[PDB]
Write a protein that binds this ligand. Sequence first.
Ligand SMILES: CC(C)c1cnn2c(NCc3ccccc3)cc(N[C@H]3CCNC3)nc12
Lengths: 279, 286, 65
Amino acid sequence: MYHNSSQKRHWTFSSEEQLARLRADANRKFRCKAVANGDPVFLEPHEEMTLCKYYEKRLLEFCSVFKPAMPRSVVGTACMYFKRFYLNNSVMEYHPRIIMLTCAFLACKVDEFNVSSPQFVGNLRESPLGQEKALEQILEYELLLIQQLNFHLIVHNPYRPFEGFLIDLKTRYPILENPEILRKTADDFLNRIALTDAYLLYTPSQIALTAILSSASRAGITMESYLSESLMLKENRTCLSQLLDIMKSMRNLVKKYEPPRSEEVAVLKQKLERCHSAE
Amino acid sequence: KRYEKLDFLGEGQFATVYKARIVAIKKKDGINRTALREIKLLQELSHPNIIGLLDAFGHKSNISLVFDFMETDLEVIIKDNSLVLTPSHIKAYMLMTLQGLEYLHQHWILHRDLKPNNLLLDENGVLKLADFGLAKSFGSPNRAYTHQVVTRWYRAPELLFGARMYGVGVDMWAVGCILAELLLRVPFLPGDSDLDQLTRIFETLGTPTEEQWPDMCSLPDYVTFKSFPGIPLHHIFSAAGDDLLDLIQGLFLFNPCARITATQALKMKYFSNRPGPTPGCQLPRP
Amino acid sequence: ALYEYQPLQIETYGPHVPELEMLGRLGYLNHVRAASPQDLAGGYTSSLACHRALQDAFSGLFWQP
Ligand SMILES: CC(C)c1cnn2c(NCc3ccccc3)cc(N[C@H]3CCNC3)nc12
């Protein structure tokens, strides 16, 4: 359950500033380590963020063509693993190409989605020697990934809260006659919310409710009575306001997110390759 | 490492346990899925009657788990002929087991391996459920389960009939078996095979009908048995009180839905009637 | 000391979830998939899935880091 989970306790952060601080500390720690052990080779935190967004997209694409059919909960767990890993680790030390595959592997194990290692690596569009090399790399990085997650493997995704909210709307909110029409767009918004840092800043229930209400507002429905009356928030004004600003900030995070650009990503990919070759 | 090994506690088909400084460390596929299951579940649970995962470490694809050191388990208590299991002791063990199981079921997790040696006892007399290597989350309709779970002696008839979907009853039935083992000091239904396990169940508690199990015939591995009358419960457990008999009957109901849940079992008069459960410090120890 | 059942309470930081047995009365089960006879025989009901979904929906809706 989320309300006493590790995700709530250790992986839900106050603001974007704390996340940027974690990423900057990771970047600076790698810079210090490389300077001591061993400058246009190094990457700044915003460049690391662009690379991380690119490879989160790569992980999503990998999971969306995985055979056998890969549960969406598994994909959410893997993407959460990726985000959490690169909160405290530099893409310059551990390559995101391997880390994302390790995240998918660990998520498949943790979610109880049973798949054999050769079956897993067969989904990679690489030659058999490449698949064996990738499997060896994943095996090397699995324990490292688990350690960097502080052994917090259960990830609470917003999809089940989304389903529960749909059940509640269909039962206790006759004003909205067919909550099913809210699904697609809400799911779409959910996808966009996944691309931001919202999974580290808000609860899965808050994210699901924000997606549903964004779908309702986009459809032209002001279903605020669900919050006021059905959710009891009429008696508590403080709770109502403290939820409304949460959804508003979530919408603003989705508004201010920018997808990585193509040739910019190419430049940073060359930079990362140089970082991992010179080392 | 940070833990200095103290003693070798045991070796199993899945892992080996060492006492160390006090804690207990359990040492191309990758990291073992049993250890990963234990970590992922015990990190999300905190309750006095559930084994605590204090730490975890490892190297390469081997991983060691750190738990609190438990002095004994219920199997050693049951098999020890020099300890008398009074009604108060049995009630205390049952109470701790059911409280841990209620907490576990509230967080939508099935133990699926309940048995006397998986119910460990600390030095203070606190019973903790352990060996979560078969434990799984339940309540999701899109996820199928294996019927091989639970050691055969404590496996529920729905599991023995091939149920791929089940709830807390699979634990509850095992709890009932444990309760029976606490009263008779011997395994209640020691079947040599699945067929023999079902035979012993029906020979002791009668052959269920549709009146007691409205959809038993839908189970994939259901085979029509002989219509046994069973044995009355007061004949099996002569020293059992009426409240204890009601608890046993609820735990051993053939219908899993009708089978009492941990919450319902805790609310039964048996736990509220006299005598009260023994405090942990006064429970028997080998 | 005689045992007394104290229902353990865990703060969910969200709206109240209707109890497991009341779900059918309140009309929730009309919006979840009906359990097949096989699932019922093993002790699986649609009520469990509905209760879990509602609990997940309401868990930590009002919580702030
Ligand atoms: C949580 C787990 C890793 C744990 C914690 N304590 N503990 C102990 N302690 C000593 C003891 C306890 C009970 C009976 C005898 C001896 C033994 C043991 N494995 C033995 C016992 C059955 N097979 C090998 N596993 C554990």
